[PDB]
Amino acid sequence: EIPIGKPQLLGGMEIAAVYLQPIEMEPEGMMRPAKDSDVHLEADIKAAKDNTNGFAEGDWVPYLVVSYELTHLDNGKVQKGDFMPMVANDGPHYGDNVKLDGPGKYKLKLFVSPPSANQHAHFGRHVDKETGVGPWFKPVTAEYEFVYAG
Amino acid sequence: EIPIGKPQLLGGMEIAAVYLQPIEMEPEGMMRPAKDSDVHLEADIKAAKDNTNGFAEGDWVPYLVVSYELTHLDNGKVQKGDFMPMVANDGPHYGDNVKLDGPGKYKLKLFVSPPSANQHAHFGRHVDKETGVGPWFKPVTAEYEFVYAG
Ligand SMILES: [Cu+2]
Ligand SMILES: [Cu+2]
Numbered sequence: 001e002i003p004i005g006k007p008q009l010l011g012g013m014e015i016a017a018v019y020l021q022p023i024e025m026e027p028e029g030m031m032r033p034a035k036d037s038d039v040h041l042e043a044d045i046k047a048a049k050d051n052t053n054g055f056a057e058g059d060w061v062p063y064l065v066v067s068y069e070l071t072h073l074d075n076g077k078v079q080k081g082d083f084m085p086m087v088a089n090d091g092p093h094y095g096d097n098v099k100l101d102g103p104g105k106y107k108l109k110l111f112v113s114p115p116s117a118n119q120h121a122h123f124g125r126h127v128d129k130e131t132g133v134g135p136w137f138k139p140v141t142a143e144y145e146f147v148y149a150g
Numbered sequence: 151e152i153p154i155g156k157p158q159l160l161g162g163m164e165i166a167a168v169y170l171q172p173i174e175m176e177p178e179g180m181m182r183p184a185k186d187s188d189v190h191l192e193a194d195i196k197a198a199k200d201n202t203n204g205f206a207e208g209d210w211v212p213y214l215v216v217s218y219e220l221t222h223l224d225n226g227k228v229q230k231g232d233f234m235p236m237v238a239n240d241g242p243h244y245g246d247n248v249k250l251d252g253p254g255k256y257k258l259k260l261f262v263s264p265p266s267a268n269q270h271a272h273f274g275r276h277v278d279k280e281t282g283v284g285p286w287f288k289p290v291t292a293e294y295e296f297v298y299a300g
Contacts, residue, residue: 020281021280023276023278023280023281023282024276024277024278024282025274025275025276025277026266026274026275026277027266027272027274030272030274031274034278053237054237054238054239054240054241054242055237055241055242056241059210059241060209060212062210062212062213062235062242063212063235063271084272084273084274085212085213085271085272085273085274086273086274086275086276087203087204087205087265087273087274087275087276087283088204088276088281088282088283089204089276089281089282089283090204090281091204091205091206091209092204092205092212095274117176117177118177119177119179121177121180122235122270122271123234123235123236123237124175124176124177124180124181124234124235124236124237125175125176125236125237126173126174126175126236126237126238126239127174127175127176128171128173128174128184130171131170131173131238131239131240132174132238132239133237133238133239
């Protein structure tokens with residue numbers, strides 16, 4: 001794995017980015033095939049100390065809505081995608097197999113939003129006095145930059 | 151909180167059940183309202199030692215499909231539903247607000263399926279040699295008998 005940029009403290013969480021070789025995933029048809037990709041991009045999102053959404057320090061934060069924008073700074077080529085939650089041998093991540101635009105410098109923007117809290121919600125929030133937690137974090141954007149060699 | 155039955159090691163996880171006061175949740179409408187309920191049933195599902203699906207011992211296992219049948223053994227009345235994932239000040243869990251059927255003996259049967267069965271929120275599994283994990287556990291069931299005071 002090659003770390004990207006620096007881990008950033010945002011929304012009560014530590015948000016880091018990494019990339020490695022393209023991976024293979026079940027269900028297969030829900031990610032770009034490894035054969036057609038250059039890297040697997042991963043967002044590492046863990047709860048920071050004193051998290052106000054019920055998570056202890058170091059916990060993976062599940063059910064987030066995570067997207068990305070990748071720019072080849074050399075020529076300005078922009079590409080956008082979504083991350084999918086998935087589990088690997090080192091635990092759960094948000095990831096996507098990505099085809100890049102050759103070597104050069106890249107800017108990575110991560111759009112991290114909280115779980116849906118309307119009629120489409122997957123993930124709930126206790127709000128009683130004894131066991132309730134604070135409101136979902138406001139959506140954040142984390143910026144990175146790296147040089148791709150391969 | 152009142153523990154019910156006994157914790158059970160199944161599918162590489164430890165599955166325990168409690169109930170407590172009906173809890174108020176946001177969004178409003180993703181679960182039976184608290185004042186229309188008698189208890190909040192909760193499944194406590196954590197990875198066991200040497201989990202084969204990539205989760206470290208003691209971690210919460212997210213994106214599971216947890217459904218239930220709750221029988222009032224005293225008269226055979228059955229009620230059914232799904233547990234939904236949610237977070238409280240002591241972490242995430244699966245649960246449901248339920249209206250009971252008076253005092254007496256109850257049997258809660260949990261049906262637990264892996265995240266590959268999750269319609270609501272897709273969740274992937276690495277399957278390459280380098281970063282992959284073993285196949286998802288086959289669906290398990292677990293029962294918890296308890297006496298409700300009323
Ligand atoms: Cu991944
Ligand atoms: Cu709960």
